[PDB]
Write a protein that binds this ligand. Structure first.
Ligand SMILES: CCNC(=O)CN1C[C@@H](C)OC[C@@H]1C
Length: 152
């Protein structure tokens, strides 16, 4: 059948929202009120991959954009990028592995592990206005926990 998707927003566990902040870049900042319309709406697709009760493979597309979060080696390091695709072909159930995140539910929060790069996570910094990135530990000063808000 088709691939199933849900519209949503994400907030880090410090309650920073995510906004597109220039060509193919996502930043996290504290937002409330009118400025919250700026937050990124994701289309979260439920994709093919290894699955368990609390570990669900997803792709994170930007709503009504041919842009996906993806994990690739850059200058020899696992990194997070926004990657454009052929809009005729996406989303699909069998997403390429660089687009797949394991959405892990622990203690009423979510982590998004790279399926391609085990133990690398979608991360934010403590400081405001810094990039969303792929971070190689769910332990230390960087934030790897999120909450999801369902959007109409
Ligand atoms: C710099 C380009 N920014 C936008 O088009 C803003 N929108 C992007 C969309 C994925 O999430 C909702 C948000 C309102």
């Amino acid at each position: 059948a088709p691939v199933r998707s849900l519209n949503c927003t994400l907030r880090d566990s410090q309650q920073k929202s995510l906004v597109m902040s220039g060509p193919y870049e996502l930043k996290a900042l504290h937002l409330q009120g009118q400025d919250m319309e700026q937050q990124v709406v994701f289309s979260m697709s439920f994709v093919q991959g290894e699955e368990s009760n609390d570990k669900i493979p997803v792709a994170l597309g930007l709503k009504e954009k041919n842009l996906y979060l993806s994990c690739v080696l850059k200058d020899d390091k696992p990194t997070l990028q926004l990657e454009s695709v052929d809009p005729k072909n996406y989303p699909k159930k069998k997403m390429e592995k660089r687009f797949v995140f394991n959405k892990i539910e622990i203690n009423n929060k979510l982590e998004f592990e790279s399926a391609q790069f085990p133990n690398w996570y979608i991360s934010t910094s403590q400081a405001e206005n810094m990039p969303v990135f792929l971070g190689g530990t769910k332990g230390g000063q960087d934030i790897t926990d999120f909450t999801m808000q369902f959007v109409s």
